[PDB]
Amino acid sequence: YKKIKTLDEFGRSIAVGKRKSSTAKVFVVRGTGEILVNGRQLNDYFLKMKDRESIMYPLQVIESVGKYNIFATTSGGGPTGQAESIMHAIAKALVVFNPLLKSRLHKAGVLTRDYRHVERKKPGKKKARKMPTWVKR
Amino acid sequence: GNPDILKFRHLKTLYPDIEFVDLEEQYRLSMVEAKKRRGKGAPKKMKK
Amino acid sequence: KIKPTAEQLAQWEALKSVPIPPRKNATLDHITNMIMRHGKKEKAQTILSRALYL
Amino acid sequence: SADLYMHPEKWKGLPPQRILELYWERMARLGSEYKPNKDELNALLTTSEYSNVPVNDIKKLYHRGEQGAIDIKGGNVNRDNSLRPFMFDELPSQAQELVAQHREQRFYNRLAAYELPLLAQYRQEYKRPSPESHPVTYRYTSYVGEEHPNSRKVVLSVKTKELGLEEKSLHKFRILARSRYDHTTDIFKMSSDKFEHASQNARYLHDILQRLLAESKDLTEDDFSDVPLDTRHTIAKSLRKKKRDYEFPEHWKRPEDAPKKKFD
Amino acid sequence: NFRFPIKTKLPPGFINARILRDNFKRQQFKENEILVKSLKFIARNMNLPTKLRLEAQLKLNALPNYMRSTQIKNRCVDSGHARFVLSDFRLCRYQFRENALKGNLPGVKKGIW
Amino acid sequence: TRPYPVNVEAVYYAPLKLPIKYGDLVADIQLRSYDNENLDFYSDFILRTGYYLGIPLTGPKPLPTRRERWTVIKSPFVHAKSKENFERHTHKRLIRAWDTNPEVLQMLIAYITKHSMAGVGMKCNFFQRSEISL
Amino acid sequence: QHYDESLLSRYYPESLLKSIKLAQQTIPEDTKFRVSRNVEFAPPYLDDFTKIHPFWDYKPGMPHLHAQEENNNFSIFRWDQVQQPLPGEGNILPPGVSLPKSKSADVAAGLHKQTGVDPDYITRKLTMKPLVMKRVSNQTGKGKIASFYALVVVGDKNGMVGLGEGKSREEMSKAIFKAHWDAVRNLKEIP
Amino acid sequence: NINNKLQHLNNMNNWNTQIYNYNKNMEIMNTMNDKLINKLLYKMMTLKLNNMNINKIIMSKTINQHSLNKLNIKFYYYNNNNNNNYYMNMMNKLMNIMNNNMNNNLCNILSYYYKKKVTIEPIKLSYIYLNSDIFSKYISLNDMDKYNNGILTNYQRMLNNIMPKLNDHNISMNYINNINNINNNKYNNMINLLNNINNIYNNMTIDNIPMDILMYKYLVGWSIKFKGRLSNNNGRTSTTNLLNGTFNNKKYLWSNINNNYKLNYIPSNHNLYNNSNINKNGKYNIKVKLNFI
RNA sequence: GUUACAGACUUAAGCAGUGGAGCAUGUUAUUUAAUUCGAUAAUCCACGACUAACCUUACCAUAUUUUGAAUAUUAUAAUAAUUAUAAUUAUUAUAUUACAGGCGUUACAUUGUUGUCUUUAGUUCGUGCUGCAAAGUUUUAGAUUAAGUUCAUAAACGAACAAAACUCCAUAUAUAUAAUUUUAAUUAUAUAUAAUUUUAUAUUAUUUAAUAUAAAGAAAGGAAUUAAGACAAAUCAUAAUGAUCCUUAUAAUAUGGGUAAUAGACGUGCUAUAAUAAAAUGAUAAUAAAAUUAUAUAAAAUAUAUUUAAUUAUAUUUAAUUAA
């Protein structure tokens, strides 16, 4: 032989989605579906429509775009990576929400952190795996 | 050029009883002796 | 041992159906990215989009 | 005694254990100022019985010593034994370092059980000067075991209002302080790094602040009220600063949505 | 008399003829640096008359080579090498690797990160 | 059975801290080493030293580490197509001293020194207050 | 649990008691360990360090960092024997090991522990006389590898002979040792 | 569940010179003095007793331990009955020139080099095989001729014949079992209270724990190589390795403890050094590596 | 110009390029007083060099030095001195000798460390056994892995350096710390756990593996480590050392010169040849990580180039910071 996540005093779920290098902290709350990225309007922050679409996707896999107010706060990285981190956080704060439907949430992959990052400069190649010219004759 | 070391040897004005041996110096001396023996030492310096 | 509300269940059932929605369009993407060059994806997507607009 | 070795005569009437190492004290503390004595040798003769070494052999070690030991050996050499087969009980040098760390930890635990509580006592009730009545805070630089030149730097940070200048004088001080005064924080901060000892640098800042106070509290030459306060430095500084002035909307704050307290 | 114009102690540790030359310049410039600064301020302050200034610019040109730091090159204190000389350890592309890998340099090993 | 007279168990227990009545700082202790071990350890003895010294100390706030790096060739001659990177992380720990008195804080610094560790460096900026002219 | 001085005087050292008075004076009634996590500052064991243990604690009168004595009033005269011998009994004997022509002595011992042949016979009543000591070699791809074939006849000049061969790539004598082995192993009575 | 501070080595130990100085440029100067100091100390390992013998005191590389409070430069020393007692000999006198000799001694003059408290602390050893560096040293100095040509069979054998082929697997298993038993005992005592330190882990004291927890101690496998001009008849090289035992700790293979790397390039248990000495044939380098579990 | 496998940027794709131009380079050929020296297939050619005005520097011209950079000896005289100008020791000062020195030659005399086959999976050791022996077996009939990985069978039984694993960065969570003014709590670390993923069904096969499906989780990478041997590969210019060659010159110094010279040739880059692309401009300053700063960074402004202003480049004065 031989912790449970809950809403805050103001009844909202906050999650820190992480990608590239961003720590997109996101306050998701039950009020009618409006967005505020980093203290300004969504179309003003993310100019590329794809980033916006990506952000929406966690709310789009559920039928809850329009249901949840979202207050995102990003830092670090570039715009697409920031948008992706925001999207992720929505999936991490959705952890507190739809408990059973969270199975689908982790499925679509919205709760899978993207290790996809920047490789280091190999101490010999021009960049990482970009070998400089090799001669012969 | 921070000046403040005890160049190996240094050791013979303070600690007197102890008969120390500088190994590298001894080796050099032995080599010199060998050179002298086999005719391959070194011509004298013109004392000009 | 906490439970899923009907509100929640409704959807689990409700959503259960509708497939997970498409995050991308294939033809478009292959093509939008077969135009892209130096990680110049936005300039690339603009192109297809506008052409398709006309 | 500690200096008893210097008196080999006083080594008389000492237990074999005693003179024993005191002989050594002499040999350990007079590398070349060692002076031979009959009483010193007589002490060795008394320690001869115990240790079972002939009075002659010990006297020979007192004189010939190493040569005398070789004479007792009869020229006998130490058959090379250095390379001894694994026999356990040996303390590996790495393991010895681990023991040293353990002993160091014991010493630290000893300090925690003695130098911390026993050496210290009830904390002294601080005076605690009120900042409104006692501003003009001073910052001093010091490095332990380091001669870092920054140690000579002295920093004086005091809010212009804390000094107590009045409107006209308050504005003039800020105009005189210029970059040193940060309007966003309303604090006037300056540093001294021009003299060897920091003490001189501290006096320098005191004089500079006193000078500024005197000039600011006297608009006979110029009130400087017409002069607009320069904040360009703080504007650039604020650009460097990265803060979040946006908070979750209060209308978006919904307590009814938040779950109520759940009793256990 | 002394090989160098002015008598100098010998650099502790590894000694090299090139190191001796550099060390000689270091010792001389260290003391002359104050004079170097004084006279250069002289020559460069327009607020002065041309002659006083010129007299000075000239003396400088006359000042011996050892009275310069541009002439002092960073040289490995252990191997007497003036190429690829990191100044954090005052060593060189090899003695560093060697000392760092051997552990002679405390807190200096390999960037496995 | 023989218990653990406070001081005894105190070592086993976590360092006891104190209150900051007026939130008035006096000095800081940015211990720095290339090794985490002695740092956190020495730090505990400091945090402890203070409790008995009655000097409300804060936590060894872990300030960021410094990743100094240097790449060199790994050969004696030519053969540069292959190279190695070296690094020297400098760890840092902060033990701000809060409400206290102008003298006592000398001991913490003085005593903490007479029993220093190996590889740990201490810097103590003292923040004093007075009038607005002497 | 601050105890009473009398009982404290009955269980701990003496002139180290004032410290315990100052110990109970400051420390409070906190029972929450609230440790800083992996402090690793406190020792793995416990029993109060009131007593200095050799080896485990630093030598009482020895120059070491944290000597806390003075560079003068030390007490380490004579430096021949290890300053701190191991504690407890003394041996680190890995539990399972026993405190530990000569070429022939081993050749025999091994076979004694193995075949059962008596050691004495092999070391005193046999003579190994090498017959062929050549240097064969193999054409490994990793470079022509050499070796040392050796036929060393050992026998008691009474009525027992054995021809043993051998082979090594390191030393010829190493192969001869092996060959003594293969022969003492292959002794055969000669009518 | 945690590597006892005693078990894992300190990263400080990995660095030969242990010192940290906010005045970085200054610290460079500090270390510089250390190595040169090491050389001077080294040269002072020679001995004389009247054209009789030179008892080379073998010394480990200065483990300089600099820490504000004071300096604690330390090195392990090694050398070769009813006589050494009533008269101290060279080695003991060397201890004297270090710290025991009031002011005329070394540590004293040494202070004028580091502006702090210089305390030398040598450590004696009884097995030239205990310290990898020392091992190479003795082999590179005393032996010499005994191998200048071939490796005297018995000399080689004696070299291969030191530790009793300590079974690392068995040693690892016993050590691992001991750690589990100690943890289980503490766990049970804690549970007895979980349902004062006295009961917090009684039966665990300076006896069943302080030494059973020590890991590196048994020279499981040792390899010594004579590389360089060590052939009187062959000008060419003559690298001769003496691989013995194994070079892996099985404790890490199946236990919470995980192998750490000194200077993040060589495992802590693996210690190795080569003492380059010039033979009459030509300079050589004897690399000696010890697994030491 | 061999049957069959497998591996990787090896090839086929695909994208960006080199060869074509100008320039910057390193080199060959050549010149010169010298263009120091070394590498020259793959592993030389932005390579030793992480920076050549002088210095570095090694080279050439011109002058100049001879116990010189030491160590050890032989003597004379100035300097601190434990006492009290009464003994004395060292510093040396002048010299003498063996020498001190050499980037002089030999990497085909060596050390040390690298390169390539090489993330390749191989190479050995003790005992045992077969063959007279070289050798074979271990190091596997058969499957399987990325891997001499792993199972079974097996004259082999174990073991070793490797493989793998631990390791470092990085990722998920959790604890502790930060009085949230060093503020980045979306962080920084110290620690702990975590996965070399697992569970279940259905086809196949043969006692239980693969392919699909779902379901649980965050689950995903990079680095370091490149074995033995061989190429007598590279280094005697990182250092060090043998042997051999010079000591009034192949040793040391100052000034100037050279390494930057150019018919041609090569390699590597840079900048290029314009619209599925280039340039002004964007002050509620769209958005970063890593890194530096007591052999210092150098902010605001202030003056000019210039008329506004901004930008850009210099000059004046140094605020603050010696670093969350």
What DSSP string describes chain D?
-TTGGG-GGGGTT--HHHHHHHHHHHHHS-TTT----HHHHHHHHHTTTGGG--HHHHHHHHHTTHHHHHHHHTS------SS----S----HHHHHHHHHHHHHHHHHHHHHTIIIIIS-SPP------TTTS--EEEE--BTT---GGGG-EEEEEEHHHHT--THHHHHHHHHHGGGEETTTTEEEEEE-SSSSHHHHHHHHHHHHHHHHHHHT--SS---SSSPPP-HHHHHHHHH---------TTT--TTTSPPP---
Does H160 contact chain F (CB < 8 Å)?
Answer: no
Residue E87 domain flag: yes
Cβ contacts of D262 within 8 Å, gap of 6 or more: none
3-state secondary structure of E14: coil
Q: What is the count of structural domains for chain E?
A: 1
Residue E85 domain flag: yes
**Rounded Cα–Cα distance for residues D120 and G18 (Å):** 11
F86 touches strand I (CB under 7 A): no
Q: Is the dihedral angle over the CA atoms A59, A63, A65, A67 positive or is it negative?
A: negative
Size of interface F-G (CB pairs under 8 A): 62
**Rounded Cα–Cα distance for residues G12 and D113 (Å):** 12
Angstrom distance, A57 CA to I218 C1'? 18
C47 touches strand I (CB under 7 A): yes
Mark yes or no for CB contact D138/F130 under 8 Å: yes
Residue corresponding to tokens 């008849």: H233
CATH code of E54's domain = 1.10.287.1480
Region of G17 please: left (phi>0), alpha (psi -120 to 50) or beta.
alpha
CA dist list (Å): H244 to D81, D116, E7, H291: 20, 50, 57, 10
3-state secondary structure of H171: helix
A2 touches strand I (CB under 7 A): no
D172 touches strand I (CB under 7 A): no
> Chain-centre distance of CA H210, in angstroms?
20
Torsions phi, psi for G118 (to 5 deg)? -75, 130
Region of A6 please: left (phi>0), alpha (psi -120 to 50) or beta.
beta
Q: Which two structure tokens, joined as six digits, stand for G88?
A: 């407890």
**Rounded Cα–Cα distance for residues F119 and H67 (Å):** 6
Residue E110 domain flag: no
Q: Which two structure tokens, joined as six digits, stand for H109?
A: 């003059």
Residue corresponding to tokens 């192993």: G185
Residue E22 domain flag: yes
Q: Do chains B and F touch (3 or more CB pairs under 8 A)?
A: no
3-state secondary structure of F9: helix
* Pair F25, H222: CB distance under 8 Å: no
Compute, in degrees rounded to 10, the torsion defined by CA atoms F103, F105, F106, F110: 150
**Rounded Cα–Cα distance for residues F97 and F126 (Å):** 9
3-state secondary structure of F62: coil
Torsions phi, psi for D199 (to 5 deg)? -55, -45
* Pair H256, H266: CB distance under 8 Å: no
Angstrom distance, E22 CA to I153 C1'? 75
Chain H residues within 8 A of F70 when measuring between CB atoms: none
Residue of H nearest to G31 (CA): H196
Hey, which chains touch D, using 3+ CB pairs under 8 Å?
A: A, B, F, G, H
* Pair D152, D197: CB distance under 8 Å: yes
F17 touches strand I (CB under 7 A): yes
What single letter denotes the amino acid at residue H118? V
* Pair D135, D159: CB distance under 8 Å: yes
Question: Which are the residues after which chain F is interrupted (C to N > 2.5 Å)?
Answer: none
**Rounded Cα–Cα distance for residues C22 and H259 (Å):** 48
Q: Which nucleotide is nearest to D239 (CA to C1')?
A: I285
**Rounded Cα–Cα distance for residues A9 and D50 (Å):** 85
> Chain-centre distance of CA H22, in angstroms?
30
* Pair G159, G141: CB distance under 8 Å: no
Residue corresponding to tokens 């090139």: E18
**Rounded Cα–Cα distance for residues F126 and F106 (Å):** 10
Beta bridge partners of A69: A29
CA dist list (Å): G14 to D128, F9, G4: 39, 19, 14
Closest CA to E72 of E30, E11, E12: E30
Q: Which two structure tokens, joined as six digits, stand for F54?
A: 């009655």
* Pair G65, G76: CB distance under 8 Å: no
**Rounded Cα–Cα distance for residues H15 and E109 (Å):** 8
Chain E residues within 8 A of F35 when measuring between CB atoms: 107
CA dist list (Å): G187 to D16, G123, G177: 65, 14, 16
D149 touches strand I (CB under 7 A): yes
> Chain-centre distance of CA E34, in angstroms?
15
Angstrom distance, H269 CA to I151 C1'? 33
Torsions phi, psi for F87 (to 5 deg)? -150, 155
Compute, in degrees rounded to 10, the torsion defined by CA atoms H192, H197, H203, H205: 150
Angstrom distance, H1 CA to I192 C1'? 9
How would you classify the pairing of strands H58-59 and H74-78?
Answer: antiparallel
Residue E9 domain flag: no
**Rounded Cα–Cα distance for residues G14 and H73 (Å):** 36
Q: Which of residues 208-247 of H touch strand I (CB under 7 A)?
A: 221, 227-229, 235-237, 239, 243, 246-247
* Pair E80, E14: CB distance under 8 Å: yes
Cβ contacts of H271 within 8 Å, gap of 6 or more: D94, H131, H132, H262, H289, H290, H292
**Rounded Cα–Cα distance for residues H113 and D254 (Å):** 70
Task: Write out the E strands in H125-216.
Answer: none
Per DSSP, C21 falls in state: P
Measure in Å the smallest separation between the Cα of G83 and chain F Cα atoms: 23
Q: Which two structure tokens, joined as six digits, stand for E61?
A: 């040109």
Angle at alpha carbon of residue H98, lines to H94 and H103, rounded to 5°: 125
Closest CA to A91 of A73, A78, A109: A109
Torsions phi, psi for D137 (to 5 deg)? -70, 145
Per DSSP, E108 falls in state: -
* Pair A123, A27: CB distance under 8 Å: no
Hey, which chains touch H, using 3+ CB pairs under 8 Å?
A: B, D, E, F, G
Cβ contacts of D168 within 8 Å, gap of 6 or more: D219, D223, D225
The experimental method is: cryo-EM
Angstrom distance, A135 CA to I30 C1'? 26
Residue corresponding to tokens 């008196």: D7
* Pair H162, D86: CB distance under 8 Å: yes
Per DSSP, H203 falls in state: T
What resolution in angstroms, rounded to 1 decimal?
Answer: 3.2
* Pair A11, D258: CB distance under 8 Å: yes
How would you classify the pairing of strands H121-124 and H74-78?
Answer: parallel
Q: Which residue is nearest to nucleotide I167 (CA to C1')?
A: H260
* Pair H231, H150: CB distance under 8 Å: no
What single letter denotes the amino acid at residue G30? D
Residue E113 domain flag: no
Closest residue to D94, CB basis, from H5, H9, H104: H9
Other CB atoms within 10 A of residue H12 CB: 26
Chain F residues within 8 A of E110 when measuring between CB atoms: 84-87
Residue E31 domain flag: yes
Q: What is the 3-state secondary structure (H, E, C) of G122-146?
A: HHHCCEEEEEEECCCEECCCCCCEE
Residue E82 domain flag: yes
Beta bridge partners of A71: A27, A36
* Pair D258, A9: CB distance under 8 Å: yes
Domain that holds residue E63: 17-102
Element (H, E) at A3: none
Count each helix (H run) and each strand (E run) in chain H, helices first.
10, 11
Mark yes or no for CB contact F121/H68 under 8 Å: yes
* Pair F126, D142: CB distance under 8 Å: yes
Interface with G, mutate which of D51, D109, D111, D123 (most G CBs under 10 A): D109
* Pair D82, H142: CB distance under 8 Å: yes
Torsions phi, psi for C53 (to 5 deg)? -60, -55
**Rounded Cα–Cα distance for residues H271 and E103 (Å):** 12
F33 touches strand I (CB under 7 A): no
Counting every residue written for chain G, the total comes to: 191
